[PDB]
Amino acid sequence: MLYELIGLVRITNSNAPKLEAKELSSTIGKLIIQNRGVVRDIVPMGIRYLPKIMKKDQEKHFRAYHFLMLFDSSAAVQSEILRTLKKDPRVIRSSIVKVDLDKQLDRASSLHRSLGKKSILELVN
Amino acid sequence: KIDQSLSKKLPKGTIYDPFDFSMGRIHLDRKYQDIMKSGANPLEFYARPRILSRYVTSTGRIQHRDITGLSAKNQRRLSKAIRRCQAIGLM
C-alpha cells in the first residue's frame, strides 16, 4: 500500500529549524526501508505557523516544520509508524492517508497531484 | 465629481447603444452581476490550506453549495478535504 504521511515536526532550535525534521524523516525512513518498505518522496513543506497554539504533550507550539513523506509499506508497519509518530515529543501532529493504487502503480503525492502532476514520471520530466 | 455607482464606464472596443447612457443600464448591471469548478478532485488539496480556505467563511464554516456553485460530488469532496485538513492540524 502507498501511504502519504504529513508530519508537523516541532522546531525548538531556532537557529536551525530544519534540524528536527531531518532526523524525524531519517528515523521514519529507516523504519520503512528496514521493514521491507520503500520511500517514494520526502517532499518538504516549509516552516508555517499553526492555526492555533497546539499543545502536544506538555509543551505548547505556535509554529512547526511541515513535511510530507510518500512511502509504500504494509498495513502492519504503517500502523507501527503511526504508533511511533504519536508517541514522539518532536512530532506535534501526524496523519497517514492511503493513496489507492488500483489504477496506477505510480502516483504522485497529494501536493503534486493537485498541481497537475498525476505521477512521479511527469514530475521527473 | 459624482459617485462611481451612478456612472457607467463603457469599456474599450465595445459597441454600445444609447440605452447604455442611462440609469436603466446601471440597474440592469447590478441585478445581473474556479479551481474546484473543473475536473480537479478537491480531495487532492487536503494538504493545501490556502486553496480551500477560499471556500470557507471568515470563521471557517464551509460554504453551502448554493454559494460555492460546485457539483454535488465536488461539494462532498471539498467538504471532506476541508474536514480532513482541519483534523491533521492544518486549517
Partner: peptide, 22 residues
C-alpha cells in the same frame, strides 16, 4: 540507508525550492 541519507541531505539541507504554499 545510503539513498535515504543522500535524499535527506539534499532535500533538507540545501536552500531548495520547498512546497511553501503561499
Amino acid at each position: 540507508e545510503s539513498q535515504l541519507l543522500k535524499k535527506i541531505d539534499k532535500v533538507f539541507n540545501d536552500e531548495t525550492e520547498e512546497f511553501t504554499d503561499a
